[PDB]
Amino acid sequence: DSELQLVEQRIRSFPDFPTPGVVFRDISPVLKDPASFRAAIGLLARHLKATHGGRIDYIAGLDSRGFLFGPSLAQELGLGCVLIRKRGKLPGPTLWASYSAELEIQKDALEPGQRVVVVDDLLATGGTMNAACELLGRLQAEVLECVSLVELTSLKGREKLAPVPFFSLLQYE
Amino acid sequence: SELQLVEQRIRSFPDFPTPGVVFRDISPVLKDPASFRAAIGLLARHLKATHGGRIDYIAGLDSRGFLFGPSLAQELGLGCVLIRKRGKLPGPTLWASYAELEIQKDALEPGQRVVVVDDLLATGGTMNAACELLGRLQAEVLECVSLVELTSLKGREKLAPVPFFSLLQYE
Ligand SMILES: Nc1ncnc2c1ncn2[C@@H]1O[C@H](COP(=O)(O)O)[C@@H](O)[C@H]1O
Ligand SMILES: Nc1ncnc2c1ncn2[C@@H]1O[C@H](COP(=O)(O)O)[C@@H](O)[C@H]1O
Ligand SMILES: [Mg+2]
Numbered sequence: 001d002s003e004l005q006l007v008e009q010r011i012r013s014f015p016d017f018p019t020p021g022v023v024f025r026d027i028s029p030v031l032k033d034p035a036s037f038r039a040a041i042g043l044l045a046r047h048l049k050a051t052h053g054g055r056i057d058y059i060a061g062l063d064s065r066g067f068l069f070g071p072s073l074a075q076e077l078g079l080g081c082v083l084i085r086k087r088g089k090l091p092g093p094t095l096w097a098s099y100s101a102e103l104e105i106q107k108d109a110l111e112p113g114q115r116v117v118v119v120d121d122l123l124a125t126g127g128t129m130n131a132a133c134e135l136l137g138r139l140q141a142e143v144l145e146c147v148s149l150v151e152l153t154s155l156k157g158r159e160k161l162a163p164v165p166f167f168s169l170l171q172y173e
Numbered sequence: 174s175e176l177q178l179v180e181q182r183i184r185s186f187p188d189f190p191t192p193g194v195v196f197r198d199i200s201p202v203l204k205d206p207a208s209f210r211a212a213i214g215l216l217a218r219h220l221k222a223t224h225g226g227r228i229d230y231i232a233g234l235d236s237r238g239f240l241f242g243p244s245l246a247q248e249l250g251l252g253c254v255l256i257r258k259r260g261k262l263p264g265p266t267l268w269a270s271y272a273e274l275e276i277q278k279d280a281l282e283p284g285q286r287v288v289v290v291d292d293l294l295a296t297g298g299t300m301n302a303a304c305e306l307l308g309r310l311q312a313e314v315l316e317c318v319s320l321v322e323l324t325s326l327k328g329r330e331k332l333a334p335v336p337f338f339s340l341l342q343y344e
């Protein structure tokens with residue numbers, strides 16, 4: 001897949017950053033190469049339309065690297081994007097949940113029954129995405145799927161999110 | 174009418190995060206696809222009319238600037254480089270105080286021309302640090318842009334002589 005190759009060639013890996021043991025996957029080059037970024041968004045959008053048809057109401061982007069992809073993915077799908085932030089950043093009444101640290105969402109971000117897909121750059125343990133799903137569930141929204149560019153399969157984040165479906169463009173151990 | 178589509182989706186919260194201030198919340202712009210599209214289109218039209226073919230990259234500022242940078246870059250046919258809170262980026266970096274921002278040393282080459290984007294200009298401290306970092310890579314900052322500007326805080330003056338443009342102004 002030519003388009004998927006355009007994304008994979010723009011992920012750079014940094015052993016022992018930010019601490020010894022972690023291999024950091026840097027999506028910065030995907031953003032810098034407009035063909036790579038277009039490919040990533042298109043692949044995610046095609047998957048989501050093929051899987052959910054017209055059932056998605058909103059994309060939810062996760063602070064902060066998910067913000068890089070959420071609005072462009074939403075736009076490609078003809079949808080709005082809602083924000084899930086690190087605690088302390090949002091005005092108005094909020095709910096919050098531990099993700100490791102805490103994520104937060106505005107109490108009026110969604111109405112009950114609205115259907116949402118969550119996007120982040122990378123799934124590791126699944127703590128961050130799981131916190132997002134908890135918050136969305138507490139607004140009585142339905143999480144249709146979580147998606148990312150990168151998935152670290154040895155950390156079993158997919159299993160943590162089950163039964164919420166998960167999809168990634170690229171997998172590393 | 175496009176600008177109206179953006180203005181009508183800014184929501185103002187008094188006394189957040191401290192008493193006396195008004196927080197301008199861009200969340201409803203993001204939530205309404207027509208409003209977001211209008212905002213990106215107005216910024217892009219400004220930048221093309223002002224700079225023609227001179228822009229090489231957009232630089233988006235962590236975190237809310239990340240919401241607009243990539244879409245703006247895509248609309249202009251350009252890539253987007255990232256300026257982050259210190260500690261977040263791998264590899265060789267430069268940093269600048271103001272809290273600290275950081276950029277990867279290979280983000281830009283000497284001579285490359287960039288426009289910086291963030292959601293809101295207040296005191297101008299954040300954008301000023303971004304411009305400092307970019308100048309230290311020997312990049313040229315053509316302009317800084319935002320959706321919202323708080324004019325009583327004199328951010329524009331802080332940035333001078335780097336040009337600045339906002340879609341919307343509040344005291
Ligand atoms: N190895 C890694 N490289 C880059 N980002 C990471 C890495 N591990 C975790 N992250 C970031 O942390 C979150 C995923 O961690 P987790 O909550 O364990 O799934 C995402 O928001 C990622 O941006
Ligand atoms: N009144 C405000 N409402 C919303 N965001 C603000 C406000 N003041 C400052 N900010 C944020 O802080 C940064 C600008 O602060 P400054 O460095 O003073 O220009 C931007 O990233 C804004 O998102
Ligand atoms: Mg993250």
Ligand SMILES: [Mg+2]
Nearest residue numbers: 235236237238
């Ligand atoms: Mg900011």
